[model samples]
Target chain A: GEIQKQLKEIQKQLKEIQWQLKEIQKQLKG
Target chain B: GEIQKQLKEIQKQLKEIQWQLKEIQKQLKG
Candidate 1:
């Protein structure tokens, strides 16, 4: 149960990191 | 100005993610 919840949380965190990386890449191009 | 600050923020986030992954790995091992 705890593992499942943590896995979901990690997925969300990974999505957030993906967005952050996109922003970083945009800045790099700019 | 904003980019430098955001870069620092990203570093913090990455460290957090690293820790989270470590915790998940521990759980998996158990």
Candidate 2:
């Protein structure tokens, strides 16, 4: 359970990181 | 521009990071 929770948290952060990357690319391309 | 190039570089790194995260999550889930 502990490891699962930690892994989920990592996924959450990684998702946000992807979102940020998308925004940067959008701005860069625009 | 120079800034655009830098942004592209950062995006490349972020893309790799996301790929790494995906592999990690796959291992964690499977």
Candidate 3:
């Protein structure tokens, strides 16, 4: 399950980056 | 390796998403 573990980490970062991007989007929009 | 191929695809999309996000950032900042 090494791939699964690695996949989870990658997916987590993807969400984190997206979250940050959205937060910045809110900053400019709001 | 299937895992490597899949990993590359995932990494590719991550770059694409980041690229689009940054483009939007440019729109707002510039």
TM-score of chain A of 2: 0.87
* Tens digits of lDDT, candidate 1, A1-30: 565556556556766876765554455442
Candidate 1 residue lDDT tens string, B1-30: 545555555577677767656655555565
lDDT of 1: 0.60
**Candidates sorted by TM-score, descending order?**
3, 1, 2
User: Considering lDDT, which of the candidate structures 2 and 3 is the better prediction for this target?
Assistant: 3
Give the number of colliding residue pairs in candidate 3.
0
Docking class of 2: incorrect
Candidate 3 residues A1-30, lDDT tens each?
Answer: 767776886797698678869867786876
lDDT of 2 by residue, A1-30 (tens): 565556556556766777775565555442
Query: What residue runs in model 1 are displaced by over 4 Å at the alpha carbon?
Result: A1-30
DockQ of each: 0.03, 0.03, 0.23
**Clashing residue pair totals per candidate (backbone < 3 A):** 0, 0, 0
Candidate 1 is scored at a TM of: 0.50
Candidate 3: stretches off by over 4 Å: A1-9
On TM-score, who's better, 1 or 2? 1
